Amino acid sequence: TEASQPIVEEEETKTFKDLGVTDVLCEACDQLGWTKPTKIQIEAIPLALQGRDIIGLAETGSGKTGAFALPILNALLETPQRLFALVLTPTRELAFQISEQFEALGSSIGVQSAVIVGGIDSMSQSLALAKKPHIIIATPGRLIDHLENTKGFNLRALKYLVMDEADRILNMDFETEVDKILKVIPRDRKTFLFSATMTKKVQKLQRAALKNPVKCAVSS
Ligand SMILES: Nc1ncnc2c1ncn2[C@@H]1O[C@H](COP(=O)(O)O)[C@@H](O)[C@H]1O
């Protein structure tokens, strides 16, 4: 069930290409100054590219965003589709930070993202959703506001779900909102869940939201 932790020689030598990342995305990494993959990237990317669900035990600073963004963008290039991936976050700040990385990696290949968070007028958000972005990065309550109230908005097309900082999502009282979202997305999708630790509450969510996941743990 557990991913192979990278050892010192592998940290020193692995490339993004070695992980299976397509050439145009290897170039985007270089352009960002991502010249070596992090350990969570080395663990999760090949498994995700093979189509495995992922549970990542990792925190900011580990490179967890690239560990899910790169496989999502790789698949998007293979099979372009709007409303392709949803990333859920506990906070609006993390949503903007994740969008910065998707835009940095994907803007030049034409990938469109939309951030859907509190503190922003709903009419700009409804327009952004009508424009059918490839990626939506949202906090759970604001996403449900749009699922309930924004005409024509739904997640039936989704191929990827990410729950980033899932321990914090649950600790911030979004259990019901997450459960509601899980009811109105497709079962046939790829899913990532990242958390700083495994707890009973996180294990309940992973058993509800992931299929045969590989556990990828790092300390840095
Ligand atoms: N392979 C990498 N090489 C250099 N920097 C990276 C790499 N992956 C992620 N980063 C940066 O690490 C920071 C923390 O990312 P994260 O741990 O996803 O919150 C962000 O500023 C990323 O741009």
Indicate the annotated binding residues for ATP. Answer: 58-65
Report the run of H or E that residue 86 belongs to, with start and end: strand 85-88
Cβ atoms of residues 26 and 187 within 8 Å:
no
Report the distance separating Cα 122 and Cα 12, nearest Å: 47
Nearest ligand 1 atom to alpha carbon 64 = 18
Ligand 1 atom 19, closest CA = 60
The domains found in the chain, sorted by start residue, are 1-220 (3.40.50.300)
What b-and-e string marks burial along 143-168, b requiring 16 or more CB atoms within 10 Å of the CB? Answer: bbbbbeebeebebeebbbbbbbbbbe
Q: Is the CB of 89 under 6 A from ligand 1?
A: no
Nearest ligand 1 atom to alpha carbon 62 = 17
Cβ atoms of residues 140 and 178 within 8 Å:
yes
Angle at 107 between CA 182 and CA 151, to 5 degrees: 40
In the 8-state DSSP scheme, what is residue 29?
A: H
Q: Is the CB of 56 under 6 A from ligand 1?
A: no
- Give me the residue label for tokens 């906070």: 91
